[PDB]
Amino acid sequence: MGPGFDFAQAIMKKNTVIARTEKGEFTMLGVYDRVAVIPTHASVGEIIYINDVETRVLDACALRDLTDTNLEITIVKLDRNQKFRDIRHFLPRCEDDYNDAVLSVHTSKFPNMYIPVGQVTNYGFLNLGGTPTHRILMYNFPTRAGQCGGVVTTTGKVIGIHVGGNGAQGFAAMLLHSYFT
């Protein structure tokens, strides 16, 4: 409907796949080459389904900060026959607050879904499902089961992936340029 939705749509149309694990279907952001991200609670194994294609996982790394605190981001390298458009130049370099974000989701359950979530707070620490988690972004939208892995964007930046909610707020894990060097 406006430039925020335009940037979000451009990311969804070229840089997302539907990932299926034993824990469900997730929006999965492709970042560059065969490298993608997914919430760590997706529990990626040796095999994953990508757009319903059986795919070998070549590497998977559950990220933690240098305090050895969960970040809730898993970086996956996929044995896929095609590269993603390189979007690393849209990743923030530092932890920040944002205005006017969109959360975008694409699954069997929620196709072509775009939510204007508004102002995004650098929340920091969250006890996420009982797990101490750092680098959390917070927005005041009542997100639901099925939106995990959803992409959080502003005009010109890909800032996070949706990892949870409390019924009134939603929470995303930061994406930082330094994760994908």
The residue from 25, 106, 148, 162 that is catalytic is 148
Sign of CA pseudo-dihedral 23, 106, 51, 90: negative
**Residue 139: how many other CB atoms lie within 10 Å:** 24
Distance, CA of 114 to CA of 34 (rounded, Å):
25
Active site residue 94: no
Task: Please report which helix (H) or strand (E) contains residue 145, including its range.
Answer: none
The residue from 72, 106, 134, 162 that is catalytic is 72
Chain-centroid distance, C-alpha 95? 16
Task: Please report which helix (H) or strand (E) contains residue 12, including its range.
Answer: helix 3-15
Active site residue 177: no
Distance, CA of 115 to CA of 134 (rounded, Å):
24
The residue from 41, 106, 134, 162 that is catalytic is 41
Active site residue 162: no
Distance, CA of 23 to CA of 135 (rounded, Å):
24
Distance, CA of 3 to CA of 166 (rounded, Å):
29
Q: Are 134 and 174 in contact (CB under 8 A)?
A: no
Residues forming the active site: 41, 72, 148
